[PDB]
């Protein structure tokens, strides 16, 4: 089989790129190792920048989002007794963010694709990339027991952190930057009303706590836990008690608890690979970089990467300007580093780190006091939070 | 001998407090271990916040300053090839800073005092504080070979980092926060024209470099060096070569070099003691806290401490409200922590740290890129730099 752009991975990166390209006339084929259910089993993100909200409307897949996604104009940071709200809409110059589950976005895009009739091969085993530097690179995979071959012009590595794309680029060509945090987040999804109309990021001596929502009858919560904790050790009861212990008393007593729908511990990490391409292979989303979830930048960076890749391929196919595709990494890395710096900051001022002396405790505390107190400080949180502009 | 407020140390803290109090009718006595020449031999600071510029005018010692001090409306940060200017006057809402040597300030205040006829005992040896919690505390010292006794109501510990005041408060009463940096600054004063009309803070792979001035025919420079470097190893020649190597080529070739008047290596440190008082003893300036010089906050925090101590003693003596003097530490520590956080930040984004991995290099670089590029970011540097308001 032949195609123009072969897409590895059917996560939101791949589905979004595949959807945008299809709509532009560029035929693409998606290869996914798992089944649609497995992909839809992932809870992950819930906060979307205005830029992605527009990319979806552009991909033509926004009906449901316009209806169910929630527009927010502020967040709340809670520390040392106090709860401080950040008015995003006025501090950013009118921008806001939309809360809409990642699982929903995937579900929508997945519906959109199936109806379009565009090719999607789920259960594609042992995918291998070949001739990345030639004019005709190709992909081999197994469907059942038959090794098939797919010829294409370009390959988009949207297969996430442990995908095959990044491992296909010769090591000596990529320079890796990485930071592993000594903690993870134990997340939880539950069919209960959220405790707040806006999100609450809480710094507490016992660790970080997050109060989020997916809808008016569905909440998403998380608490920082050591990397040594196994999820089967945290009963629902244990979670809510721990959650209540880390929140402001006035919030903890408004909390409507309930049985969990999903629970899992995600480890924290920062990871950037430079550059993000090799010959005719271009990396996007988690295949190239990882940011700790504290800043909600993961899904959002995948969308911006994809937005840039889509727009550079339109020009190459449509305007014959394949030279522009060399600019890909440079354009993406500028955003990527800014977002990695903001995600890192958010993480360091809201989380409790082990083995921290008195001076750093006081500085973390003061970082919060200064930033939530200054008008200039709040603005840096706001403009970064709603997401910096696309270049 | 008796007095109302005994002042230990004749540095700018002591002289300023002593001058303000004298003018208010409150009699004070200053005790200095060294000689006036030794004190005037110290080069130290050169940048003053508007708040101190006003405190001096209030202490009535500003004629010379109004004439020789230089008002600046911007600074320049130079990194990775580029040189970015920060317009302080518009980003802070009209504030600026004054460049005027610390040695000058001391010299002025010292002239003012001698003419006032107020008591100053230079060469006061082996000073000891007694009865700090009684109603009549006292100070003993030796002048030549005679141990004299000074009775007073209150004692102001303005004796700097290694003074006797802080060691007089029972250890179990103070909680100490401290950070020692793995480097120091090798400073240099020279009778040459400065290379810039505004200061230049430079981040370079070889380390930090600073271009400052004391006047139109006098410059002050500094370069970050390891803690293992002895000043006698750095000839003047060696300094300028090193300085030129760390600056932008366009600046390095405008540099007018020359023989040094002064040279010395000052180690970097962050230090805060809580609280800043014990009974009838109140700590001020370096006696209580140390900030790395990167943010120019040292002399400025001494002035604000002194401003608060002076104003709380006016109320006690003048209005009989000695209860207010309990509020001293709390008022001072708020400013102190904000300034310690800003000085720490400045230090971490302009200095080269040993044993730093790739990720942190990129973050330091991006911290600079984001802050010098955002309008909100530049404002946080500006408002902090010109100095936050006095409470
Ligand atoms: C474990 C994890 C937890 C996260 N949790 C959060 C969170 O709590 N909150 C938040 O804000 N962000 C979170 N994120 C980030 C966010 O979910 C991601 O940034 C976003 O899902 C990435 O989209 P993607 O398309 O780049 O990758 P993914 O969602 O990982 O999709 C990648 C696709 O690659 C497919 N695939 C993998 N290898 C192969 C292969 N060799 N061949 C074929 N197909 C392959 C995968 O099955 C998957 O469909 C999380 C990310 C991870 C990895
Ligand atoms: C080594 C050093 C270098 C510095 N360099 C810089 C710099 O390069 N740039 C910058 O911006 N800031 C610098 N500073 C900070 C700035 O110079 C200080 O913040 C400011 O001088 C402190 O004023 P002070 O009155 O609190 O202390 P000081 O200037 O230290 O004055 C304290 C006084 O205490 C007297 N004394 C000490 N012990 C006794 C005693 N037991 N009895 C009697 N008298 C005593 C001392 O002789 C001195 O006169 C430096 C500080 C230090 C300590
Ligand atoms: N930082 C954030 C904010 C919201 C969510 C969420 O799942 O709602 C998250 O996973 C991380
Ligand atoms: N950070 C700064 C700025 C100026 C001076 C100076 O001496 O001129 C300094 O010592 C430190």
Swiss-Prot record, chains A, B:
Effect of residue 162 to D: No significant changes in affinity for p-OHB are observed. However, the affinity for NADPH decreases strongly
Protein name, per record: p-hydroxybenzoate hydroxylase
The entry's keywords: Aromatic hydrocarbons catabolism, FAD, Flavoprotein, Monooxygenase, NADP, Oxidoreductase
Keyword NADP listed: yes
Cofactor remark: Binds 1 FAD per subunit.
Result when mutating residue 269 to S: No significant changes in affinity for p-OHB are observed. However, the affinity for NADPH decreases slightly
One MF annotation (Gene Ontology) recorded for this entry: flavin adenine dinucleotide binding
Record organism: Pseudomonas fluorescens
SUPFAM superfamilies found in the cross-reference section: FAD-linked reductases, C-terminal domain (SSF54373), FAD/NAD(P)-binding domain (SSF51905)
Family per similarity comment: Belongs to the aromatic-ring hydroxylase family.
GO biological process: benzoate catabolic process via hydroxylation
Residues involved in FAD binding: 13, 32, 42-47, 102, 286, 299-300
Consequence recorded when altering residue 166 to K: Loses the ability to bind NADPH
Mutagenesis or variant effect for residue 33 to S: Slight decrease of affinity for p-OHB and strong decrease of affinity for NADPH
UniProt enzyme class: oxidoreductase
Pfam families according to UniProt: FAD_binding_3
Reported effect, residue 269 to D: No significant changes in affinity for p-OHB are observed. However, the affinity for NADPH decreases strongly
Listed result of changing residue 162 to T: No significant changes in affinity for p-OHB are observed. However, the affinity for NADPH decreases strongly
Entry EC no(s): 1.14.13.2
Record's catalysed reaction(s): 4-hydroxybenzoate + NADPH + O2 + H(+) = 3,4-dihydroxybenzoate + NADP(+) + H2O
Documented effect of changing residue 34 to T: Slight decrease of affinity for p-OHB and NADPH
